[PDB]
Design a protein around this ligand. Sequence first.
Ligand SMILES: CC(=O)n1cc(-c2c(C)[nH][nH]c2=O)c2ccccc21
Length: 112
Amino acid sequence: FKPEELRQALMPTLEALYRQDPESLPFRQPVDPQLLGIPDYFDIVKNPMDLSTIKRKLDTGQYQEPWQYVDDVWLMFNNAWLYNRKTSRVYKFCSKLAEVFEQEIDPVMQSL
Ligand SMILES: CC(=O)n1cc(-c2c(C)[nH][nH]c2=O)c2ccccc21
């Protein structure tokens, strides 16, 4: 795939996640376990991922192939599902972002 064409294809799905308010707010920066008061976080979550890390990777040609991008998005959600209780605000927000991403990524990958 062409970098600019791969970037262009996937772009709208990322922007879809950013457009969700307030659901995208806990996902815009890397989790800071000190600030958030969750000192066990890095013991439980061994490979953190967030929107800003994805965007920087996308925009700088780090994704040579779509599933690399998809795997990073999926990791972000699975991290939050793993760490947070199912009744928590962040967990509910996560499911919302995940539902949105599936409905966006299907028609994209059904062409690339
Ligand atoms: C992604 C993730 O697991 N988390 C995100 C937050 C968070 C809140 C509630 N406000 N701003 C944030 O970044 C968070 C808080 C506690 C545990 C996990 C959290």
